[model samples]
Each structure stands twice: as C-alpha cells, then as structure tokens.
Target: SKPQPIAAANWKCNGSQQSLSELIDLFNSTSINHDVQCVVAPRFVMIAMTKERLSHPKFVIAAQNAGNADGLASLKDFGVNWIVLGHSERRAYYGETNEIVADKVAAAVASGFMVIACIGETLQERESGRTAVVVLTQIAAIAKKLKKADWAKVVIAYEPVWAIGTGKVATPQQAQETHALIRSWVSSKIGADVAGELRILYGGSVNGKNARTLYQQRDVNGFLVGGASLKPEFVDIIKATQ
Candidate 1:
C-alpha cells in the first residue's frame, strides 16, 4: 500500500484546444480506480483548461516544466501539485545537466510541489554497459540536494533515451532489471524505508498493449507516458494496475 500507482501523462509540446477538449471528455467519462493516481501535464497554456475540463478528484494536473520558487507559487494558483523535470529532451535540447535538474528539484519541493524527476541511459551508454553509472549519477546529484524527508514528494521516472520516440519498449525483464537497480540505489543512499515507498515510473514508448506486462514488474510502480497519453489508449494504461 505504500507505493500507490501513478499514470502521469507528459503531453510535451503537443495538442490544441479542440484536441485536448476531446481527450478531456474521454478521461472525464472514464472511472479511475481509487488506488491509482492519474496526472496530465499539458503545455503551459493548456494547464488551466485541462484542469477545468477534467474534474475527477483522482485526476490531477502536472506542469511539463517548472521555474524558480516564485514561478512555482504561481502554478499552485491553478491547483497543480506535480511538475516533470529532467526529461532527456530537456537534457539534450535545453542543456539541463544533472546539477541543474537537482537545483530544480530542490526549488520545486521547497515550493511544496511534487516532482517527477527523470533519469535514463542512451542506447550507446547501455551498449557500453554504463547504464548503471549514468543513471545512478543523475539520481545521486538530486539525492545530495534533498533531505530524506523531501523524498516523499518525489517520483523517479526512468525513460531510456533510446526507447523514447523509437517505437521500442524495454522487454519486461529489461525494465524490471533497471527499476530494481534504481530501487537498490535508493535504498543504499536514502535508506530502506524511503526506497520502499518511493514510486518509480518507467517511460519510453509505453502503450496500452505493453502496459499490462510492464505493470507486472515488481519495482515499476507506474508510467510517465508520452505519445500514447494524447490518445484514448491512455485509459488502458491507467487500468493497468495490478
């Protein structure tokens, strides 16, 4: 009961009023399980509208990106409690190094916002057997900035750069293996209790069909969905809880 399931949608710079309105209608019409928490992060402009349209208590709003403490206070005005940071896209295109991501996490949590801090390896890194080093280093950067208590407000999302937008899903074994490694690292750094309750989400090309299999992974608490989040298939992922 410690790690509640979370299915968070990262709409990443896509969608329109009409398109999102339709998606909202679809989400509002579905019945979400009480044990699951669903979050939708629309582009900045759409946050208010999405919150207004999708009124389910089990559903919450997340900002795709965040700013400093003052800027984060403004988001609370719209009842947003979650923010996604350190996506590989942000690292590659926007140059958010591990230090920057750690700073953002500190600011967000200080402002009383929950965070989805992402970490993962590129295909080349995985091939070179540096997956553990790369990923753990990223988390260590953030871990050093927060007190153990702050961990309660954070979720770690592992979205492999290679799998993202590549139409490739990590075999369940691969996902579980990586997730287990992350959990083990958390346990060692943050303590056993904190690691046990920390929700670890897997992302990258996740869809309805593969969601069920992925959900079965002991360490994978849920997903940070991308392309599929815009479609009706997101409902299937939401229902993937065990």
Candidate 2:
C-alpha cells in the first residue's frame, strides 16, 4: 500500500477564543488537497468551538492531551475524531508513565479516536545512546495494551524531546534513521504487512522551511508540527506534501 500524508498541528495551551476563531477562519478558507490528512490538537476547552468552526469533512480536531483513557469516550460522544497521546511535555511535566500512555492508547482505540501516540528520547538520553532503546520500550508498552486490530487506528510520532520547540529540528537523516528503526521494530513485533500499513510521523520543531525535505524521506510519512502550526507557515507545510 502507498503511504498517506498526514500533518497534525499541536496548539498546546496557547490560543484565546479570538485567536482560535481567527485561526479556524484561516484554516476553513484555505484550500488543501484531498490526499493530505490535516488535523489539529487544540487545548481541551477549545475542542468543541474549534470543531464547530472547522466542521468540514476534510479537516479534523483533536485534544492536545487527554486526562484519562475514559475521557476518549467522552470526546467521541462530543464528536471528536482524534487525540494526541504521550507527548513529551505530558510525560515530563505531568509524570505520565509508559504504562499510563499504553492505557491511554487502549482507551483512545476503544473510543474510536485516531490516536497519535508520541515516543522519543530526551537529548541526554539520545546522547547517552539510548534513543532506540527508549523509543522501542515506549512502543512495546503501547503494543502490549492493544489488540492487533487496534494498530490500524494508531499513528506513531517520533518527537525527540530536544527538538520540540527548541529551534533544534532533527536533521533529515536523523529523523529518517529513527523512523526506519521504528518501522523495523513494528515489523518485527507485528509483521511487515501491518508495519507497512502504519504511518510514522516526525515531530519536534517542524516548520515550513524544512518540512519538504522531511516529507521526502522514505520513512517520514508526515509531521506533528508545533510553533509553526500557529501561522500561515502551517498551511504551507500542509501543501508541501504535494
């Protein structure tokens, strides 16, 4: 099967209603290709409003962080179609353990939200030669909680902690190597057919300037953008895949 392009914007606690409304207007008015799956993870309070404003069939809204696995059911009931789980900030600042993230993934799957489960190493961890080890451990934890069928509803995001919002984006080679390693791990654990079906996205300071190169990499199916997502640059990043 061919890879599908996905671009997700994570707003992370930074938007007033006015700003959000403006952003939605911009998003709704802009044209995007059908082949690109465009999604945004806004603060929970903005979910309904954002959803209401950008209710087009092609655009979707997600929660920046879900409080509990069961909360996913509530989100689904409220008409949300996606959620971002296990972000680095959540893991570091909120003390979310791997087990918790696994539980969240299971809940999101059960609730029918397409989940973007994040996994990555901190700069220290990466420099200490634990990047692959840390990433694989996180992936395995989630896989253990999921039924094989649930894998189809999940997208893995490899966002190195050092690169997120630090103006320190991963080099294309660095991102591709990690993505390939992730794919191999999935293939070994879940079989090649299933691994091939999954979308692996590179996150962490992704912006318009470098999005094209990252998109062109064989293993990089898309991006999980941060700061650049709040501006017109995001629209350019979305169109870059084309």
Candidate 3:
C-alpha cells in the first residue's frame, strides 16, 4: 500500500483571500475529519494566507501551477511543499509540454517540493488506441530528467482530458487499468520497491460518492478535486477513503 493516500483539492482560478481563509480555517478547526493526506491548492494570491493560516498536520497546501521554477522557491520560503504540474489546462491553454512539465518537476524537487505531475490522453487519443503510449511518453520525459532520489518526491495523477470537467468520468475499472499500468511503468524506471511507494491518483470529475469507489482500486491511490474543492462537501470528498 502507499504510505498514505492523498485527497488533494485544486481550486484552479477560484476563491479569494477571504474565502480560502474561511475554507482552510473551517477544515483546520475541526478534529481532522479525514485520515488520509489532504492537500489544498488555492489561487496563488492566497498562498501566503494559506501558509500562515493552515494549522492542522493532516492538511497541506500546493500551488495550482507555476510560471517558472522560481515559483517553487517562493513556495518553499513560506513552507509549502507540494506542487501541481502539467495540468490539462496548462497543456491546452498555456502550451506546456511534457518536457516542460518534466523540467518543472526537476526544479521543484531540487527546490524541495513534492510534485504531483499529471499526464493522460485526450478522448480522441483514447478512441484511437494511443492512451498508454501517450501517458508513457509523458512519463518518459520525466524519467530522462530525474535521478533516483527525485522519485521519492514525485506523485503522478492521470487526468484524461476528455473526462476532466465535462460531466463525464473515468469509471473505476478504467481508472484501475491505467493506474495499474502506470505502476508497472514506474516499476520499470524506478524499480519495484520505489514504484510500490509511488502513488498515482485518478483526477476527472471526482466527487464524494465516486471517490470512494476509485480509492478502493489497488493502484488508484486518491484524487485531485476540481470543482468540488471549494464546496463545503469537500469534507466528504476528503473523507472518502474512510
């Protein structure tokens, strides 16, 4: 089993200083509702407050995306340790490539941040039977750039572009298949023991009810919540593993 499952919420381009403070405060004020690792990525503007305000051990903060490698240094200055790289939004809208994400992963781990590096195929690619190939290609980019020590600081998330935020989701069986394949791929690059320690999450329209099913998969470790991260129901999503 993974050392711990992570329920990471990515509040992409959402929330303000006040709103996030309230959200973080609410989660912190509780008796730690979930047993799994809970990481929240708020808008960049609120990271300072998120760092200063987060008081619970179970909860940590990650950056949604970065403009450059230095952003990781800025995050480390304030004690944030997790980072999200190669989100589909960045790929489609910002022109970030697999190589770019791998570069960011290298810089991030060197700067001392744990990275949640994302990779997945589009609907067209899946329909055309290039899913695994595309995903492995992305991982290949990272493998070339990283050393053995770097694998310890990395987490991978598979977010098929087609399923992301379109009212569609990767079914549990589909998610497990990809996740299991990713573990095998990791086993090849980083060795079986390190790959066993690696966690690959399923990220596509994840919600409380469906999250539990995904978490039950042998290879599916957890989630990267999108729309639901800002809602009060995020607690339920975080507690899905329980």
Candidate 4:
C-alpha cells in the first residue's frame, strides 16, 4: 500500500502564542480526513505549547530542524516525534552542507524520530537543466548514511529553491515529473518495493487554490506547505487529500 499522504505545515520563523493558539483552535474545530496525516511544525520554542493545544488525533507536531542527538532529545522531550531536516532555508542561511544534512538525518533517525528530508535545486540549476542532478545528489548523500530499514521513517519533501517563498508554484505537470523522477531514483538505489512505498511531497508556494490539482499527480503524495500553512486555507490543503 502507498504510505499515508502527509500535509505538514512548516511555520518557518513565523508564529506567536496568540496566533498559534488560534491556529490550534482552528484545527481543533475543523474536520480533517482520517486518511491524511496532518502535522504542524512550529518554531522550536513553540513545540510543547502547540502540542498541548492541538487536540485532534490526526494532528501531530514536528520540529523544523534538529542539529544533533541532543537537539533531537530535547524535541522528543517536548513530545515532538517528527523533524524536518535539510530545509532550503537552513541550507541557504546556515550553510548546512549535504554532508551536514546527512549527518543530522543519521542522528535524528538514530534518536528515533521520523524525518522529512528536504532536497531541491536552485533557480540557476533548474534553468541549466540540472534539476535531477542537484536533487538526486542531495538525496544520495543522505541515502549513504541511512540504513535500509530507516526508509520506513523517512519522507522526502522536494521544494524547489526558486519557488519557495517566492509565490511561484511549479505547474502540476512539472511537479509530477520531478516527483516521478525522484521515485525512479529511489527504485534504482533501493528496490522497486521501497520506491513504491516512499511518499514524495512537493513544497514551495503550496496553497488552497493549487493543492487539489497538485495532489492529483500520482507521485505528488502531499505537501510541505510554507506560508499558506499559517492561514485558514491550510484546512483546504489538508482537505485536498480527500
């Protein structure tokens, strides 16, 4: 069977107590399908509070990044079991190299946390037709360190660097083509079975308006939503899974 579709809200560097509380209330009151897995990744400081306030069984908490085992432990302490690693912002701003990202993935998985390992190509690379080269290279680095069994806990989120936060969304055909290529890469490296079960999510400028079309793609399992994740429309994106 295919893995459950994941609609993960990445509230990157944005959210406050009042706003977060309201968002939690919105989620609590809204009706989400039991089939889709809904995760909210708030700022690191807000994890515990968000966890306590978000009451839906289908809802869970995720952390944006965890640098080491110690950091992973701290997040676990707050009852956050999922982490988003190798996000484009972390790579662009913090100088997180592919090796560093792979190390963090190793540490995070070793510490028993599910991980969303992000990979993408920059505009220049995309324009140069090196999207596959860049994305597969990023995934290869992490694949080297990951145990075969760890595939069960790893979800890949493909967020093109140029589209993220730029209000630019990849056309559904473009996103599906890339997602399918990624799955093919997984099949070549692992096996057909592992590749068949892996869920690849498209990130970058995802919103209610575009989600349904994106979700229709066979390989575009779900989204790792950015800005739109913070709004009421997030429920619409979640509902897209239905």
Candidate 5:
C-alpha cells in the first residue's frame, strides 16, 4: 500500500462563525479527489462547529493548536481527533520550545488525537547549516515521548519557518530532501517499516500553482496549505492529486 496523499487546510487565526459557515459551504460545493484525504484545522473555537458543518467521510477537522501541554484531553473530549502541533507560528509567536512541543505531542497522542507534528528550522538556522540538525532535534524530542505503536498516527509536516505565509514555497527537490531526511530519522529511531509507512507533508506557502509538483515527489506525501486553503482555490489543490 502506497502512502495516501493528504491535503490539509489551516485556517489559522482567521474567520468568524458566519464566515466559517460560508467557507464550509464553498468547500462542500466543490468536487474533491476521493483518493486524497482532506482536513481543515480551524481555530480552537470553531473545531466542533466546522466538524458538524463539513462532516463527510473524506474530509476531517483538526485543531490548529492543542494548547500548551495540558489542553489535549479537553480537546479530545470536544471531539477533535486531530491536531496540528508545533506549528511555526506557535513556536515563534507563542514561545513554544522544543521541550514544550514534545510534551504537547505526547499529550495529544495519548488523548487519542492524530498528531500532525510540525518540525522545521528558521531561515537563519537553514542558512547557518543547521537545517537537518534542527529538524532532527525536534523530531527526536517528540519521538522519545511516543510509544512505538503510536507511530502510525503521527504525520510530520516540514514547514520552513521563513517560507510560511511568505508566498515562497520550497521546490520539489528541497521538500523531498527534508522529508527523506525525516523519514530516515524515523527509521533509525523506530523501525524501517514504520518509517516507510509514515506520511511526510510539506507546509510552507503551498498553493494551487505548485501543489502538483510537490505532490509528485516521492517523499512529499501531501500539503499543509496556508492562505490558498482558505479560498475556493483549495478545492483545486485537493483535486490536484487526481
């Protein structure tokens, strides 16, 4: 079985209830690729409402951030089964450290939420030759906290901090290089089979224009789309895999 292609939309800190309803309506109206698994991560407040509004077998909802280390259980009780942990913005703007992210990952996984654990280096770190080192460090931290059996529920997203929301997407080669590195780390830490089965997504200014090429890369399993995801164009990106 090959890795399934994933298309996730991160609404981030945007939209109100009425606006979200309209957005969900737009998403429901468009045709999506049945083979691709699509998800939308709305802000914490909208998770349940969005889940109810867009409750389809092919599409699922994720919480934008699972909160510091302690909010996971409450989120799970609220019916959010997936979470985007350690997003760049959360790390940079909200002061989330690697240790904090690791704890959050453990809590989310333990609480039964599929963890989309994000790891990436800043432009400065990448420029200073610490890209792989930084990402691996983050991954190792989280891996240390997980049970080997929980590996299947972990989806890694490599979102270079600088490219996020900047309209600068990594080339397929760049994305593949990082994704492969992360898979190798997983293999070394866990087992080859688990690593091979893991889905590695690229998140950074992923949009409709370049989504096709990124999806074609062997290690680039899917996308964690930003701005483009909030628009009707998101449906086009979701269907790109088809």
Candidate 6:
C-alpha cells in the first residue's frame, strides 16, 4: 500500500491551450500500463484546462505550487487532488527554505491534498557528499510539521539537482542508493510499516529512454519529469513500471 508507483509530470511554466490539446490527444490514444498512476501539474492557468481536456480514467491533475492560507479556500474548490512541493526550481528560484516547504506540506496534507513532497541536493552539495544529509534534513522538516497520521498523504520525490535538466541522469545505482537512504531515514524516524508505505520517485532529465532502467530500480517507484514530460516520450515513461 505504501510503495505504489506514480508518474507525475511537472509541466513547470510550460504549455498553452494548443499544446494541452495536443498532449491530451496523445495521452488519450496511448495504450499504457493500467496500474501506474499518472498525474500532471500544469501552470495555474492550465489546471482547469486539464480538468476539461485530460479526462482519461488513468489521469489525475496536480498544482505546481500553492501555500497561501488566505487564498487556498478557492483552491479547495478545484476538482483536483495533488500538489508538487519543494521542487528544485521552487527552492532555488523562489528561495524556498525547508521551513517554507514544511509549511506547504503541512497545509496541503492537512487539507487532504496528496502532496508530492520533493527533496534533493544541488551538484555542489552532492559532489561534497552532502546529498544524504541535505535530503534527510529536508524530509525532517516536513516530518516535524506533519502529524504521523498524515505521512501517508505524501509521496517523496528525490531529484538530484545535478542530474535535473542537465541531461546528466543518475545511474540506476546512484538513484537507488539515495532513494534507499531516504527510505531508511523514514523507517528510522517513523515505524517500518509507515516507511514501507512511502514511494520515492526519481526526477531530473527523466526521459523515456532512461526511465525504463530507472523505474525498475528497487527504490525508484516512479518519476517527476521536466522537459521530457511535454514530449510524447513521457507516455513511454509513464508505462515504465507496468
């Protein structure tokens, strides 16, 4: 129940009405794995568009980011269920610290949002061997804020900063090692039962070409795709686990 596979696309400030139509056309026609859950996080403007266009049975939509307590009431009115938090771009560009991410995670989880909580290390940090510590600290912040009962409301996505969009994908071994470490951290901080429920997805330059290898890894339950997600190849990636 905890390690369910998920393929969530972070459209990341990309997509227009025409592009959405085209993507939806392809998604509807593609024959894919029925078991893996598919999700998309388009720009805010496209969220409603997604609800209308991508009405396939296997599809679910997510928000790119949202943490405004005052404005979230209307968000709850949306016919959606998930949100991406603590992504590398959000952290690096908006200067979102772990505390802010924890706030968002708490807010989203408390509101029954299926939070795709992200944690990762930049190239410098990973090169300096701080990847483990960085990820653990990021996770710990959210763990401290969320009630133990809420842990199952979130999925952990691990994107090595260096590998993201740089066309430098982590080797399967590299991805699995970090993912297992994340899992072990959860296991130690919580109980084995809850830890087993958590799914860790690999992100960063996750094209269909590499997804087959990565998704089969012991710890990689799915992917959070960037540029590749806009391409037809993403359909292939979504079918990797199945």
Highest lDDT: which candidate?
A: 1
- The positional error of residue 23 in candidate 4, measured at the CA in angstroms, is 1.1
Cα RMSD (Å) per model? 1.4, 1.6, 1.8, 1.4, 1.9, 1.6
User: Which residue pairs in candidate 3 have backbone atoms (N, alpha carbon, C) closer than 3 angstroms, thus clashing?
Assistant: none
For model 4, residues 4-84, the per-residue Cα lDDT tens digits are 899999898897899879988999998764698888988877877887788998988888888896677777777779998
TM-score of each: 0.96, 0.94, 0.92, 0.96, 0.92, 0.94
Off by over 4 Å in 1: none
In model 5, residue pairs whose N, Cα or C atoms come closer than 3 Å (at least 3 residues apart or on different chains), thus clashing, are none
lDDT string for model 1 (111-167, tens) is 899999988888888899998898888889999899999999999998988888889
Better of 2 and 3 by lDDT: 2
Q: Which stretches of candidate 3 lie over 4 Å from their true place?
A: 33-35, 67-69
| CA-lDDT, candidates in order | 0.88, 0.84, 0.82, 0.87, 0.82, 0.83
**How many pairs of residues in model 4 come into backbone collision?**
0
lDDT tens readout by residue for model 2, 204-233: 989888999888888888889978988878
Better of 3 and 6 by TM-score: 6
TM-score-better candidate, 2 vs 4: 4
Ranking by lDDT: 1, 4, 2, 6, 5, 3
